[PDB]
A paper describes a structure:
The exo-β-1,3-galactanase is a glycoside hydrolase from the basidiomycete Phanerochaete chrysosporium (Pc1,3Gal43A), which specifically cleaves AGPs. In this context, exo-β-1,3-galactanase (EC 3.2.1.145) specifically cleaves the nonreducing end β-1,3–linked galactosyl linkage of β-1,3-galactans to release d-galactose (Gal). In this study, we solved the apo and liganded structures of Pc1,3Gal43A, which reveal a glycoside hydrolase family 43 subfamily 24 (GH43_sub24) catalytic domain together with a carbohydrate-binding module family 35 (CBM35) binding domain. The N-terminal catalytic domain consists of a five-bladed β-propeller (Gln21–Gly325), as in other GH clan-F enzymes, and the C-terminal domain (PcCBM35) takes a β-jellyroll fold (Thr326–Tyr448) structure, as in previously reported CBM35s.
The Gal3 molecule co-crystallized with the E208Q mutant occupies subsites −1, +1, and +2 of the catalytic site, from the nonreducing end to the reducing end. Gal−1 is located at the bottom of the catalytic cavity, and Gal+1 and Gal+2 extend linearly outwards. Gal−1 adopts a 1S3 skew boat conformation and interacts with many residues via hydrogen bonds and hydrophobic interactions. As shown in Fig. 2 (B and C), the C-2 hydroxyl group of Gal−1 forms hydrogen bonds with NH2 of Arg103 and with OE1 of Gln263 via water. Notably, Trp229 supports the flat C3-C4-C5-C6 structure of Gal−1, and Tyr126 recognizes the C-6 methylol and C-4 hydroxyl groups, whereas Glu102 recognizes the C-3 hydroxyl and C-4 hydroxyl groups. In Gal+1, the C-2 hydroxyl group forms a hydrogen bond with NE2 of Gln208 and N of Gly228, whereas O5 forms a hydrogen bond with ND2 of Asn180, and C-6 hydroxyl group forms a hydrogen bond with OD1 of Asn179 via water. In Gal+2, the C-2 and C-4 hydroxyl groups form hydrogen bonds with OG1 of Thr226 and ND2 of Asn180, respectively. The C-6 methylol group of Gal−1 is exposed to the solvent, so that the side chain can be accommodated externally. E208Q_Gal3 showed small movements of Trp229, but other structures showed much larger fluctuations. At the catalytic site, Gal−1 is anchored in the appropriate position, and Gal+2 appears to fluctuate in a planar fashion as it interacts with the surrounding residues.
Author numbering: 21 to 448
Write the structure that this text describes.
């Protein structure tokens, strides 16, 4: 049944908001382990490397925290611990965790290591350092599938200007040699997945918390040469408002796992997971608002839903129709909220709880929100991130309770702040 619904608030088996940002994924046997920053405290300072497990990548269960602060050290609560990655060391039968270990102004620019014999740990800190003497901020660990299972650190170096790939020693404890450097790449948030014997690097450019168009690069060796940057998503959408975290191989394709960073409320940062489809020979995000993964078969199924054009709705109050090449049908409804509404009618449904995808444009740099009322019911307030332009449409999901047969859905009523411009909705 379960569904990967990007943008919705995800909850563990305990009903608590998952707090595993900067995802790192490890698969011991039939269990998946998801590692991330715990951001419960709405701050970038360190609180925990969390630990969640699952058997099918949707139903997650929060274990003990795999790494926890230590006062007077550099994994203390005055420091920063980002993007935990974990591979398994066959030789030592040992789980080695890498992370970006830094100071609160990111001037320290180090890696940190920790080990444990249990996948979810807890892990003991072995210390932090500059890899081969150089800056390391955003990083990732690639485990090759050669016989030695050689591991590589991927990291943004020299104040994020030069992207580097270096080989890990046979213990995964330190870096033995450089392999590759892209000078002036200003790449961060890296991941690598190996597909058809070719290495694909995925990475953001550097733009603070602001999402930018993430890029793919390929090479037949980790040393290179690497292809020039290409898009994994439509450029205007800024990776569908997200930033790469982990790229997990899945059958003959992969899953793109990104974070939607909310700097002003970091705990509430969302998880953006999409099929990464290689049918063209290269990774492309499949913009699936709702989709399912069958891990055992390495397949994904993209749920198909029904589109309703916001402009075919019934406007109320001071809402308007707007025109733009970014809108589906060429139109959207503006001036929603602050006295303007639109009701979408004859939304057909077998009844129950249905994921509905609100397609909108938000030209501001800050969040808006919209009220959503089904058949005159009490409204839920749905968040609307900055979209990248009044002509750029991304989508957020809201789970709604419909009746069998004909429903209505009302946007913008009972809110004094303007909402974002509604392009359409897709009822799954
Ligand atoms: C729903 O979206 C609206 C905007 O679309 C959000 O309203 C904005 O809300 C913020 C925070 O509540 C307001 O901020 C503050 O303004 C006061 C003085 O006005 C200032 O002293 C504070 O430092 C802060 O900046 C902001 O005025 C408001 N802007 C607009 C245009 O409405 C609202 O917060 C969202 N609601 C939810 C539940 O997320
Ligand atoms: O804001 C913190 C947050 O955002 C990301 O990245 C930023 C930081 O890693 C930061 C560290 O100094 O560097 C940003 O990059 C600029 C660089 O692009 C510019 O040209 O020069 C300055 C030199 O001071 C700086 O290096 C980067 O955007 C991370 O993705 C996220 O995890 C978190 O750290
Ligand atoms: C976990 O989610 C999966 C959906 O694929 C399913 O087994 C069920 O809904 C959940 N199981 C439990 C025990 O909560
Ligand atoms: C790795 O080597 C660095 C030198 O850059 C050193 O500072 C650090 O302590 C070493 N750590 C381990 C675990 O070998
Ligand atoms: O500020 C009020 C207006 O702002 C515009 O940017 C938006 O496209 C309109 O639909 C309306 O919301
Ligand atoms: Ca439209």
């Amino acid at each position: 049944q379960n569904q990967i619904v990007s943008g919705a608030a995800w909850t563990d088996t305990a009903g608590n908001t998952i707090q595993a940002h900067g995802a790192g994924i490890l698969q011991v046997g039939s269990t998946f382990y998801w590692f991330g920053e715990d951001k419960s405290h709405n701050s970038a300072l360190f609180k925990a490397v969390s630990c969640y497990t699952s058997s099918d990548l949707v139903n997650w269960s929060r274990q003990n925290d795999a790494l926890s602060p230590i006062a007077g050290t550099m994994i203390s609560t005055s420091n920063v611990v980002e993007r935990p990655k974990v591979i398994f060391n066959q030789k030592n039968s040992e789980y080695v965790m890498w992370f970006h270990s830094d100071s609160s102004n990111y001037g320290a620019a180090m890696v940190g290591v920790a080990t444990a014999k249990t996948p979810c740990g807890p892990y003991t800190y072995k210390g932090s350092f500059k890899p081969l003497g150089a800056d390391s901020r955003d990083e990732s660990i690639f485990q090759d599938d050669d016989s030695a299972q050689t591991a590589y650190l991927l990291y943004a170096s020299d104040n994020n200007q030069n992207f580097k790939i270096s080989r890990l020693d046979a213990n995964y404890y330190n870096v033995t040699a450089q392999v590759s450097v892209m000078n002036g790449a200003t790449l961060q948030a890296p991941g690598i997945v190996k597909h058809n014997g070719e290495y694909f690097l995925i990475a953001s450019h550097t733009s603070g918390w602001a999402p930018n168009p993430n890029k793919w690069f390929s090479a037949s060796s980790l040393a290179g040469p690497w292809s020039a940057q290409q898009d994994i998503a439509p450029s205007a959408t800024r990776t569908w408002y997200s930033q790469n975290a982990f790229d997990l191989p899945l059958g003959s394709n992969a899953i793109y796992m990104g974070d939607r960073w909310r700097p002003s409320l970091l705990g509430s940062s969302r998880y953006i997971w999409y099929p990464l489809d290689f049918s063209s020979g290269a990774p492309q995000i499949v913009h699936a608002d709702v989709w399912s993964v069958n891990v055992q078969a390495g397949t994904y199924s993209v749920a198909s839903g029904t589109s309703y054009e916001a402009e075919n709705g019934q406007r109320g109050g001071s809402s308007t129709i707007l025109s733009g090449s970014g809108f589906s049908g060429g139109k959207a409804v503006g001036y929603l909220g602050h006295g303007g509404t639109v009701t979408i009618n004859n939304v057909q449904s077998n009844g129950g709880s249905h994921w509905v995808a609100l397609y909108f444009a938000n030209g501001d740099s800050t969040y808006r929100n919209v009220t959503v009322s089904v058949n005159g019911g009490p409204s839920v307030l749905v968040d609307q991130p900055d979209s990248g332009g009044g002509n750029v449409v991304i989508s957020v999901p809201v789970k709604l309770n419909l009746n069998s047969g004909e429903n209505s859905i009302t946007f913008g009523s009972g809110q004094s702040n303007y909402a974002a411009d509604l392009d359409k909705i897709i009822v799954y």
